[model samples]
Target: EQKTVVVTTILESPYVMMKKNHEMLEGNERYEGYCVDLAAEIAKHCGFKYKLTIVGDGKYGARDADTKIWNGMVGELVYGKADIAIAPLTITLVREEVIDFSKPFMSLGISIMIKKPQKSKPGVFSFLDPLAYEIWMCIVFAYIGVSVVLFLVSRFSPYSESTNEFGIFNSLWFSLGAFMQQGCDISPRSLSGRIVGGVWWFFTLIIISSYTANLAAFLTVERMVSPIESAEDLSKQTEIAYGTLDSGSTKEFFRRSKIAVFDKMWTYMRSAEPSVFVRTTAEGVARVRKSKGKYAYLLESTMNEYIEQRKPCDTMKVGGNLDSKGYGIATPKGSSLGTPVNLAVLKLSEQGVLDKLKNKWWYDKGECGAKDSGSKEKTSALSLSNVAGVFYILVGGLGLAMLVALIEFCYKSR
Candidate 1:
């Protein structure tokens, strides 16, 4: 005969949730969720009676620096208040030092959570977006090169006397007209001029065709302007404030991190005005929603993905997880129950019971539909700002042509 085990847990949704009409229910029947089911399975396999209790401090268990005392489920196990701890409690180096964790029941890592970026409005100059700025600059350089070459070639060719019809201005005009696919009334009489015109015509044909091809993609596919796409992006900017839980493995991860970027972020978080850290996941999530693209939340990937599938689903997980760790059933160091519980968890994992339980709690009973709830349909029309580069190129060419014309007029007058 085995003695009854006191199990401590936290009230994290999908992991541990309070049962409805709980005041009427007795014992473990008052609780439900992935962890609840997991606890029952572990108890059944270990052949032990157990009592379920929530952590007193309502925390996931973090050691206070000032007091040097562990709080939450870890503290419960450490102080001999509970025989085992089960929840979405992450296994960390610090916690492991105080308590023995069974083999990982679920693996996860820190990730960024943000509201879905809004679709960008179209711009009047959106036509220019097909080409990069460097390409546009190169096109301008090529245009000037071709025009000067044609003018010089026409001036040297022995086609006519002194009336320079294909002078610098006319040469620029001819190049611009050809690029626009509109032939000018003036034609170059010299063979050299005709050759330049033909070559320029070919170049314009290819450029125009390429621009036309890329324009469709630039127009039809709506562009979403996300402020931060990754953790690096978040760290590199201050416009959108980012933070993690005030007290948890996430905060400790940053505090103890040796990585430079994460360390910098942690420093910023600690010193940020108004405090970047939040007291609860709900408060963090609410800040993300209410900040209106001004704030980002750093949390575990499991919760991030789960929240992305919930109703009023505006939040999205950005980039890959930062680090990898797992959740485990915690027991007192060298407790007689540790080995049995660890074996039971391992068996359940190998049998796919854990995955089945997650699917049931996370997806089957999800408030939002099975399809990804965070993704929004983009029906917004593209604006000119989305394609302004091409228009800038067009304007630049006309300005250059006018400047060349003015220079030619001055030279001819002299």
Candidate 2:
């Protein structure tokens, strides 16, 4: 009898896919991708022959979290329906119990998918907030110190010239006059008085510069950071049409989380029943592109990269990884084949065969071809800091020009 291994996987493209003429093709030629290549490498190392099989069910591994049957094509392996499963099955603790996983061939994490917001609001009183406590505290203390010193010096100074009364109004006027360098009509001629006036002028310049620099830095930081838009927010925000691959991990996450827009995602899927899920990640991404600005697709970063190179939709992004874990091959518990398969993975990884596979199957497109393709779909979207820098430069240039011109005219006229 031929030594046969049945490997289960989902059709996540550039990672796994049935060739367009797969039904007509023979053996390994029918399937091609990163995972397919990895599987072949592992099989070769383990000295076994294997055939790729689609997971019987669409779910990764379902847990009632109550019943915990954990049934799926992945479960099929645990139940002994298949000898091995080399899909990008995320290694979760629950699934680990029923099946044994090889050391992670890949690692990924879940991140929120948002539309890359246009402008982030100032945070909820974060220290990054415009009027942060530290900033306000500094302003208050600086103003108070400058005011107090000016007030007491002006009140006692004989160069109030023995004419301007050393009183509250005189002190207040002196403080303002010193800050503006307006040449107080009430002059302080005493040696100590002159020293205080000069020091106050220096402090005023430092305060003005500090305030301006702090405000600019605060705005720059605020614009660069954005808040996570929750699943609920995605549902409520009608402006965005969001979608995930039907029946894949993304869809499963939405369904399990019971996101309010589940029906909307379903509508986009266009399936009569939830069971008839969309077949591929490419399809989900296609739906997002077709929905125009209103639509955004949630897909794995790897698949997203493929879409980015081909038709290229500017409106969509990978957002955040929904959930993160290492992807490993799943196998029946205590199968004799497990150790050999792991050893193969480790050997190929150590020999750089795994890296070569990923590049050939996904990242490598020849430098010239990639450059040409990237140019056709160039995105000119300005980064947040870039936009802020342009705005501040304009404001500072205009302000400085006016200040310099005013000073030049005043000095010349004098």
Candidate 3:
């Protein structure tokens, strides 16, 4: 009841990949990666001998629309070509309906990928990080809240009789003067306005004093730009177009996602002009580099990150991830091989083989150099990302000021 078992896998880099000097070889030794390496380890425990068969079509597996014929790794299994499939095949509901997945050997997520932007090490605007948003918010709240209180105090209370002079514009201008400690030509004449002004001064003094005090700590810190903070932004604008592998778990994720943002994205991808999908993860990254029209590739984190850490490392994970999923070893439905495969994976997990192997492949071979490694330059405290909130807060302040300026003109014109 036995022949040397045949393991069908894909040539996905860092998972199942060709060895650097593989030209001299023709078998399992011709390839190496997390999946291939795990196969060898998993094999010893199962008491089986095997040959690694790279799936002929190089696809994870997808069915043709009209013929409904399956191809790629999963196809090889259902057609009875291999004893097992130990590739980094994704665990998806539709795929599982026909094939079987071992309990996941590794967890991953549907994530976005973008080429890394130029790194900016220091800035003339490095001041943004020194004063945290909480502090800045406290300062702005006083300026606006007190400015409004000053208006109510001047406009209606019989406290200041000739008060159109303390109109909305003057109120805002006076507040800014106090905030910067550069006194303006306007001052409040009543108890309420003075009280508002008094409290505002105390806040501005403390906030500004602390700003200067904290400025010395974060004068230099590295920052990398990523326009799309999360998946939400990708759908909010048409400026950047993103796509997933034409047929893979990542594509299926957007297709079946229950969340509104995901649903919106999926609809756009399916209906968008010129096609938003790429045929492979490699093609996806290539699209990103030549993406003059601005394109983003969506895929699994394990493979996404492995590419980011490799040489010419021009890509980076945009944010955390869109959804949680996993990559599992797959086989045909009802195959008795599933039980032993799952058991061996679990044993290796408990023995920490997965942990060590992950590090060995992801970082032991990392070309990006130490990840913001121990200690940093210039007595740094935080990155530009830490202060990214300030930009939004600053914009809101400007917008509200414009609103007040317009209100002053309209009220006086009438």
Candidate 4:
């Protein structure tokens, strides 16, 4: 019979966390999270039962530049302090040389988590805000609607069979000219074409007048927005300082990156006053909350996403991932268990357990509420009272134009 496998994991929330009553619970029963469940899943598949031990160092793993000593869960595997490590341990070339990693079970990337920017102060684009964003979307679709109808109506108008006047470009331009109340060289020739033109003009008149009336209110409302959208933005600007977990992969990513923007960002973080680096992800988060938008935390997407939805939900993740990577269960180099653990990881991924666990922890347990979350997105809309009429009006106008074209077809047949 084989020995009971001992696994070393970290105390990261939603992955591996201490139970509230840990003072009483026994063994693995004391801990719970995505990894805790995943640990059991692997245990059942491979054989049964294993000892769960949180790493003493509280690190994913890293090698010091001078000592070259392995630390964290990786070290546990390398030195045989543990037989397995099932945590959010990232797979990297450096670690690969020391310990074996199962195929990735969850993919993640570097993410920027910043507090929600203050109420946006007014700026050049203020003129555009008078209409709700949804309204602007409808207006664009209305433009497309008229252009399509005009093009097709002209298609049906056999009255002027000469060179089709409303090719798509001309149709698109004509509607814009009507929308702008500007003159265009080509005009619709047939009754149906005139019907479309008249309705498009009417639609434009209402829209333009509304825009003009709303312009003052939007232009007058003042605001401010988040300063950084991308890593490049973080590096170039100094007003908002940014950092990463001091001992994690994210820190190493910046420290070792050749990419100019990331390299520059690392350079800044390394030297930023009062030490931008944080010992743990929570410390980084606490720093951000207390800094009042002056500091942004750079960390893995999974954790960043989790904290963004948790209470005190002021944090927001901006920009796409900077680099793609994954979390893998690890074993000592050449250990016989690596292959089975790898297959278990692959099987769990294909079986959708990974996705379910992600939902269970990331969204299912989210603290962001419909009424009080700090997310820039309002869970509740002002509930579409005013300005919704414009959408109905636009829809009716398009419908009317289509029917008018259909009637003109009957006239042509006669």
Q: Which structure among the candidates has the greatest TM-score?
A: 1
For each candidate, give its TM-score against the true structure: 0.76, 0.51, 0.64, 0.65
Per-residue C-alpha lDDT of model 2 across residues 1-414, encoded as one tens digit per residue = 767777777776678778889667854677888877787777777779877777788545445566767667856776766888777666756567777888888777543233333454433334334344576687557656766675576556444555545565666677677676566687666666677667777877886787668877754434363433455566555556555544446555554555446656545445433333345655554554554434555656655555555543343243455566687776777799988888887887678777777778766742335434445433355446543545666798998889998888999996
Which regions of candidate 1 fall more than 4 Å away from where they truly are? 1-6, 72-83, 145-171, 220-230, 332-352, 363-414
Worst 10 residues of 4 by lDDT: 377-386
**How would you encode candidate 4's per-residue C-alpha lDDT over 86-186 as one tens digit per residue?**
88877888778767778888778888888876654334333345677888888888889889988888876475565576787788888888877666788
Error of 3 at 141 (Å): 25
Whole-model lDDT for model 4 versus the true structure? 0.77
User: What lDDT does the true structure give each of the candidates?
Assistant: 0.80, 0.63, 0.76, 0.77
Model 1: how large is the Cα RMSD against the reference? 5.2
Cand. 1 TM to true fold? 0.76
lDDT of 1 by residue, 1-414 (tens): 547878888788868778787887854888888888888988889788889888878875456778868776667777888888887778877778777888997888888888877755556665556676788988899999999998888887464558578778978888888888764878877677788778877887888788878877665644557677688877898888888787777887778889999899889988899878788888998998999878888888888878886777788877977889988888888789889888898899899877788788877866666344366666666456665667778899999989998889999996
TM accuracy, model 4: 0.65
Off by over 4 Å in 2: 58-66, 70-72, 111-283, 313-324, 366-414
